[PDB]
């Protein structure tokens, strides 16, 4: 495996470092490592594709080295380069794209492929060099079992998830109390109603919360915390819980009291913030709780007492919400975020070549179903499969 | 180094022989030459290799630096105003080219001659020779006037060689020139052509 | 061209690895590269500037070189080099900006400028080197002829548009049917509303769609899709198409019902998604198609029947919506996005500089109406125009 | 691909200058070339075929050389010749077809099939000679990035389309105004109808205008412009524009009346021409706006009077059309026209051999469906396509 | 300037026959050529523009010769080479150009820009060389004076020319009879109608015939004739001869009778041909005289009996057509057709860089205007001018 990094790394800083006009010295250092390569290839011979609608393909190995000779380069010796070059990406391309499609239950972390399996091979080794790229060095600190880590922006953590919980209810439901809510990615929206706007309440609040817990841990995480779940805060026809009926929300919007957001590992508090809306930090944790409340308004204007009175048809809901986006996290699992093209990488190479549901990944590499369901034969697969799309990316974009 | 000559056996000769446990000859051919195919793959030794890096750097300067030979000449078949400058005095000096064609000589010699030269000189052209030259310094005031510099030319062509084209310089100095009656007469030198050796 | 670049990863690798007491074989390699340079350089004479607000500087070279020579650099070596970088940064910037305002319908893909008109000269060659910063990688790339692409996280392919269409409308504007939209960046929000809560409709179920053509086709695209248009969510008073009166919109939202996306590539369909909120990938397509439909709740409570009678006036008026977002995509055109600040460079250098409007470019590199109207000639000007603002902002920020 | 083309020009210009008699001196710099090639060929093996019904064939080379020892050529010589070259015929036919069918989304621009991809290969570069073939000429100059350009007569530029758009219509169909048109090939014919023979029209005068967008620009094109649409001067019995019923058509032809054609560039007008018919030229444009009008004659005899109540039944339909035909043109991109007969081959191979519909071009290579989304992933495969047709032409037809 | 030619047949054979792969001999012969050009050239500079939009550039000579580097070129041999190349292509388009757009009465025949005057110099004369272009091969046969000669596809030899002759009018136009007519590029369409269909007419026929007299003599030429005038098929209201009222025409067909087709030279019948419809051979005319008749048919079933009666008013009237296409045809003086592009760069030139009306050509190169009054100094101009456009397309197209 990390043998293909490698192979990239080499043509990329190759691709690049080497045009019409530079000194040799400022490549002596490369070009060796270049050469190395050609040999260790030479007499092999290989073999990819074979599954789904992916073409075969087969390859074989006898080049010239190169000119370790003049002081400057002339643009002959680029083309004659360049040739070779683009054997190899084609090839890479083939390699990465058939040990990006198979999958595996017992062993999901190993290589695939009789391409790759090939590579392992000790003979190879003999081409390794600059791991830099964030991901393969992740690869290795793994191997080694060591403390990994990645960056990301609007992470994905959050399988899709919106619905309700009905407190209160009743077959008319014309007086409710609940909270309706929508997790999804890096984002919670979360609203609590009271239709009674707490008249028979204990100290005239009624208490919500909301409960969120990760399938993986996210460390060092800048967050966004605001008052009010917009989402919910317009009039809505919605389904009844049993899907018998159809009821009324009709939202009016008041500022949530006590609020207390906190970020948990394994049950303890590793942080907590009362009423504290702006950005927050969260520095390790695995599960989130918002607990909020409302409380009905101790003086009112008439227009406002108005929307309250003291006996049914209540025909506006008081509701509070709050919203928390995660704007970056760590996390020492795989996962999609907003910036990254992995997924889309790995997703978009199976789609186009009609590769079959494997028994590891969900249909269609689906996110939701795959961070609800994240088993280590999922993550390692997850990861395996991402660091080839990074090191494919390298090149071919 | 652009040496296109020695480079096979040459350097590879020295090397057995300094090894001493061979005696080279019985050596055979297929093997000196594979020998260099091998040696020019590798790196060099930061020492080695990090002087030469330093003569090249310098090479330029000092090849103008010296005193006998300068890079090529010019010839212009325009009356051209003589320069001067504070070390040889009144003389017919370039210290750049661009304007004319460049003929690396050392091309033309290595090559053989089309006459392109041949053509241009013919029906007088602007043009400009490349390369270290040989060298030669006059004082005949006179000579000026005489346009010798337009002459040692037309040799090239008779004996296609070229190493015979000792260019002129005209060190004229307000002094060690028994000819000058020439600041005692209003006037101007007209030199047909100068010479590239930047100054020291 | 190439050649500008080298300049730069010249200084940067420069003004970074030349500090007070750092090893000499660090920069062995380095140093040369750099010498070399001033060779080729000293001897020309430049001119910038000349239009609009832009000065006219003059510049000459004749320069000293570097010795080699010192185990450890001296604060003394820093310093006399520094004071030569200075006149070089100080350079390129009036370069960059020189050839970052000038535009031409024929080649605007070609160099402009007196000032590096004169550099893609041949005799500067000699100072290429280390090509591995995105852009320039793209640009070699592409002048070979061949498959360029770029990464952009919430790109901006949407031209600004926010508007709708009445399908069912009537002087009074009491019993509407259409859409209603925003287009803009990297986000689509559209909602169908329905007067009359399909009433008298065939399955009492009305039908909604929207279509939106993308100028450039995105692939790799990671997008995040969800019910509900919450910008359509609230009253509004709209001017009438005619711009003649104003109509009252009252939503009150439904779920979208039978949700379909498809994502196609000139009118064949590639990605397809039947009611997947979350975040789901469209591998490669030049249109997104957004069909939906609003179903009249077949049980209702009282409550919710109240807000649909048989007969006008509807006062409630049921509405149905979906969001889409774009967070990451490729592109082989170039395009704004929400990180990279190119267009702002550009768009900042000509404001600063009183730069006149063009023959290429909008007033003001306005991006709606650029994108509105890519034409080749603004694709191959913005190209060099962002390449350019990338190679300034490796030493210029 | 270059390698390609001189394998035939190399056949070519040798079973042609080739024969029974001639002098060596004719081909002495020939023979040579050729020889060069048999060396480079000899010992490498070959695969072509393998899809659809295409037959797959294996191919060795092991031959001796040429007698370039001769004065004159004796039969003998030749037929000992003639032997070796049916080998390659018969070879290149089945390399060009094995090329000529695979088609590909990411780079349809490079080499698909395993014979040709082991081409472009380095080691096969040493046969390149004389690229003289109109398009290979073009072929290299676009690797180069340099201006290409094609030599048509009557193009194949506008997507069939034949429809028309009533401006003034009511159910019974009695009443109408409009226009219809024919946009095929290198043709427009396009007729605008007032029924009522512009009896209210503002001036007695109804403005008509047809708009056609070139998929590609046009240059140094040679046109006809005539007035009348001969195609829509004779009664119809049309469709109406929901299909629901159909409408009678009894035109009577009049002039058109100011007559404008603009050939516009990116909205701007490049050539003008009013009322002018006959040849015209349009030196470049992606855009034709044909502007003409219909005015009621303001003298009639009675005869004429009698077609044109004031009041309706309207029974004789006022028209007025043009017709224009782009009778050559040159394009920077490859098209289909009415004399060359790549469309065609390419066409053909590909249904002789049943070859299965691919992801790039639409079923059958289908004219109209091609030109109507020409992107550009179309036109580099079609362009490569067109070129290794036009090799194949070289030697069999 | 044949001296003209050569230069561009050697870039051309040479852009061509020199690419990266091909072995040294083929090009031995070629190289030579080239060199010997350089020569001659260098030193002597160069005038070009100077008028209209036309800018003023000034090229100078230096370059060096080319080297012969054994066995196949090397690619860095191309690249020294294409940089040189490039510079004469920019010239030539340049000469082209501006010696394309200057007329003269007195010598409209010889050079007239400072460019090329200075070409015909005789110490030029050293290059000439493969004059095998068809244009420039019969530019030379001119000078000695010969039989010259051009091939072209529909040609462009009937100026437009759209009118009707009444033979038997009267103020209301509703008994005419005379025919109608267009005469277009290599079409000819002619009608002849009697509204009384020869009631009263000497053995009830009418006798019809239209005459073209060509302004240039054509020879071998290919002719479709074809029964019929289609566009003078249908209903149509025309402008009175005095344009002071409208008439109606009102065309019912019947088949022309005793059909003959005369291809006259200089009065003389050269071809005549007897209702024959399809392809005939005109070999050598200057004019075409086409007579039919119109016989009223002397047996009609009762519909048609009721088309035609005995008295006015004459509703329907009877018309006999022919139609009649020049495919193809030599012809000795240049000539616009349907494939070359000769007419569209000169006339495409002259417009894009704004160049002023001359004393020769008609405002826009007008081809009805040019082709009516083609005088020899037109020709003469126009033949230079073509040839010039012809050594241009070898290079730019
Ligand atoms: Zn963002
Ligand atoms: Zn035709």
Same mark, same amino acid.
């Given at each position: ?141 793994? +191997?080694?079992? @060591?403390?990994?880590?990645? =960056?990301?922006?609007?992470? !994905? ?5 919106? *619905? /309700?919980? &009905? ?103 590793? +942080?907590?913030? @009362?009423?504290?809306?702006? =950005?927050?930090?969260?520095? !390790? ?5 918002? *607990? /909020?409340? &409302? ?103 | ?200």
């Amino acid at each position: 495996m990390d043998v293909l990094y490698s192979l990239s790394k080499t043509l990329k800083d190759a691709r690049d470092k080497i045009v019409e006009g530079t000194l040799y010295s400022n490549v002596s250092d490369l070009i060796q490592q270049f050469n190395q390569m050609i040999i260790t290839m030479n007499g092999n011979e290989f073999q990819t594709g074979g599954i789904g609608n992916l073409p075969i393909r087969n390859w074989n190995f006898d080049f010239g080295l190169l000119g370790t000779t003049l002081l400057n380069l002339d643009a002959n010796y680029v083309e004659t380069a360049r040739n070779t070059i683009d054997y190899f990406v084609d090839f890479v391309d083939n390699v990465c794209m058939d040990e990006m499609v198979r999958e595996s239950q017992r062993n999901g972390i190993a290589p695939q492929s009789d391409s790759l399996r090939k590579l392992s091979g000790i003979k190879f080794k003999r081409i390794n060099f600059d791991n830099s790229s964030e991901y393969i060095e992740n690869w290795n600190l793994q +191997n080694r079992r @060591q403390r990994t880590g990645f =960056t990301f922006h609007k992470p !994905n953590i959050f399988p899709y998830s919106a *619905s /309700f919980t &009905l407190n209160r209810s009743q077959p008319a439901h014309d007086n409710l109390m609940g909270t309706m809510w929508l997790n999804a990615g890096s984002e919670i929206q979360v609203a609590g109603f009271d239709y009674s706007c707490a008249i028979n309440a204990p100290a005239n609040i009624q208490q919500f919360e909301h409960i969120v817990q990760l399938r993986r841990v996210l460390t060092t995480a800048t967050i966004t915390l605001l008052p009010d779940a917009e989402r919910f805060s317009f009039p809505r026809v919605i389904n009844s819980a049993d899907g018998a009926t159809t009821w009324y929300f009709n939202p009016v919007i008041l500022r949530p009291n006590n609020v207390e957001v906190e970020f948990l590992l394994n049950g303890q508090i590793i +942080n907590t913030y @009362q009423a504290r809306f702006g =950005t927050i930090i969260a520095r !390790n944790f695995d599960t989130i709780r918002l *607990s /909020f409340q &409302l409380m009905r308004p101790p003086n009112m204007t008439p227009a406002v007492a108005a929307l309250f009175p003291n006996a049914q048809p209540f025909e506006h809901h008081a509701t509070v919400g709050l919203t928390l986006r995660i704007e970056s996290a760590v996390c020492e699992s795989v996962l999609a975020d907003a910036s990254k093209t992995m997924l889309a990488n790995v997703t978009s190479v199976r789609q186009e070549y009609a590769i079959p549901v494997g028994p590891v990944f969900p249909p269609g590499m689906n996110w939701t179903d795959l961070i609800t369901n994240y088993s280590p034969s999922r993550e390692d697969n997850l990861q395996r499969v991402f660091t080839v799309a990074s090191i494919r990316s390298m090149l071919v974009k | 180094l652009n040496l296109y000559q020695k480079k096979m056996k040459s350097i590879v000769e020295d090397f057995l022989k300094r090894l001493q446990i061979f005696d080279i000859s019985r050596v055979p051919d297929d093997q000196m030459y594979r020998l260099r195919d091998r040696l020019r793959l590798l790196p060099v030794e930061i020492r080695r290799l990090d002087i030469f890096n330093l003569i090249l750097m310098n090479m330029e300067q000092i090849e103008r630096a010296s005193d006998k030979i300068a890079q090529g000449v010019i010839i212009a078949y325009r009356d051209m105003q003589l320069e001067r400058d504070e070390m040889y005095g009144y003389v017919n000096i370039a210290r750049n080219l661009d304007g004319f064609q460049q003929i690396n000589l050392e091309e033309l010699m290595r090559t053989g001659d089309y006459a392109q030269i041949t053509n241009m000189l013919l029906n007088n052209q602007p043009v400009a020779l490349v390369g270290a030259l040989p060298f030669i310094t006059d004082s005949s005031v006179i000579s000026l006037v005489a346009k010798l510099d337009a002459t040692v030319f037309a040799q090239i062509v008779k004996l296609r060689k070229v190493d015979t084209l000792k260019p002129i310089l005209y060190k004229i100095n307000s002094d060690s020139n028994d000819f000058y009656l020439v600041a005692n007469y209003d006037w101007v030198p007209t030199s047909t052509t100068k010479v590239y050796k930047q100054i020291p």
